[PDB]
């Protein structure tokens, strides 16, 4: 805290409580006994505990009928409206899409739809597979996910 | 038909105005003024203006007839204290509060 090093008081003789510092944390201004630093909150996960975890959640998705497998999943022109039409037709709304390759048209069309996300098999993560009502995987997507977890 | 008048931030302590306020509480307004007129207090001058203001509020706006009014409520509250300093011996300083009052007087024909 910005300020001076001088004792305010004569130690003894004045009727006040003894002081050392106008930056003492009991004093108004310049407190903060155990101040914060920038810090790294990240945690370790074992390779195997991560893969094991992905497998458990994916297996539940099957059991709860929230996983949808298809031969292909792609879109023609990069128009969100076009995707929107398709999704209604499939009776999907809040959904994660995992495709075989990072398909760009599909990627562009999905950006403005909040309830829709697109992902290549390489870029999957544990929380996304949970955070959506339905999950769509392409046949190709399965084969890539399968090899990865094995 | 209660009718109010007030002097806010009167320069006297509420304590001192209260002695005089007490002399006219409950009284006929004609009888109250005479009491005030011959009370030897600065505070007798301050509240009397208020009572007279209150009387005039009653005639002009509605009420009227000076005969019917009584001082049915009167209360004197604390205003804010003005802060100053008085030098004492050995470089020691004292606060002085220059205290003020809100004087309220209520009049009604009933």
């Amino acid at each position: 805290v910005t300020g001076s090093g001088k004792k305010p008081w004569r130690q003894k003789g004045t009727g006040r409580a003894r002081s050392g510092s106008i930056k003492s944390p009991i004093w108004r201004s310049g407190g903060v006994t155990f101040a914060a630093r920038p810090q790294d909150h990240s945690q370790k996960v074992n390779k195997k505990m991560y893969r094991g975890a992905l497998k458990s959640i994916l297996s539940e998705l099957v059991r709860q009928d929230r996983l949808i497998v298809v031969e292909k999943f792609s879109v023609e022109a990069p128009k969100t409206k076009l995707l929107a039409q398709k999704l209604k037709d499939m009776a999907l709304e809040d959904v994660l899409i995992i495709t075989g390759e990072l398909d760009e048209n599909l990627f562009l069309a999905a950006r403005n739809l909040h309830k829709v996300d697109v992902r290549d098999a390489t870029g999957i993560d544990p929380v996304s597979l949970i955070a959506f009502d339905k999950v769509v995987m392409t046949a190709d997507a399965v084969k890539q996910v399968e090899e990865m977890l094995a | 038909m209660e009718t109010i008048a007030k002097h806010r931030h009167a320069r006297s302590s509420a304590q001192k105005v209260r002695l005089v306020a007490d002399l006219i509480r409950g009284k006929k307004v004609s009888q109250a003024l005479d009491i005030l007129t011959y009370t030897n207090k600065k505070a007798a001058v301050l509240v009397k203006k208020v009572l007279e203001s209150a009387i005039a509020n009653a005639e002009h706006n509605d009420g009227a007839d000076i005969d019917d009014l009584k001082v049915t409520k009167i209360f004197v509250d604390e205003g804010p204290s003005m802060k100053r300093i008085m030098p004492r011996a050995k470089g020691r300083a004292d606060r002085i509060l220059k205290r003020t009052s809100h004087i309220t007087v209520v009049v009604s024909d009933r």
Binding site: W9, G13, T14, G15 | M82, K83, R84, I85, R92, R95
Partner: peptide, 27 residues
Amino acid sequence: EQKLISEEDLFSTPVWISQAQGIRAGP
């Protein structure tokens, strides 16, 4: 037009020098 007063009530007067000062004891 009743702007707050200067007051000048900063009170750094504390604390002046303080001898007993005083009785003699006790030896």
